[PDB]
Amino acid sequence: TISAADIEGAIEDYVSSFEEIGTVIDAGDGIAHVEGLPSV
Amino acid sequence: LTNLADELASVAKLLLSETALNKHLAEPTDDSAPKVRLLERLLSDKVSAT
């Protein structure tokens, strides 16, 4: 099941699939952590 | 069934060895279509239909 670097050619097509919008992952004490927003 | 088990074990070791692909493939997401497309582009022909 040897696989070459073709995964990079596919995974890149998968990350590029996703107006940036993030998701709150945790919150407390006036601090909130947001996933996503790569360009913030 | 033996072929299915062998293929699944091979895929499991592939994911273990290739950490980044498994990481990308594991993030929960509302729509799985990108993940399915990623699998098909990766190993549509390498493994059997089942």
Side-chain angles (χ1 to χ4, degrees), chain B residues 3-4 7-8 47-50:
Chain B
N3 310 338
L4 181 135
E7 279 161 292
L8 281 164
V47 309
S48 54
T50 55

Side-chain angles (χ1 to χ4, degrees), chain A residues 1-4 6-7 9-11 13-15 17-18, chain B residues 10 13-14 18 21 24 29 31 34-35 38 41-42 46:
Chain A
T1 185
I2 58 184
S3 279
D6 199 340
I7 69 183
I11 297 169
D13 185 21
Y14 159 72
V15 306
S17 300
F18 305 131
Chain B
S10 51
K13 69 164 213 176
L14 189 158
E18 173 47 70
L21 172 54
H24 275 75
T29 179
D31 50 345
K35 275 175 179 208
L38 167 53
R41 192 178 195 290
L42 275 163
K46 282 226 181 156

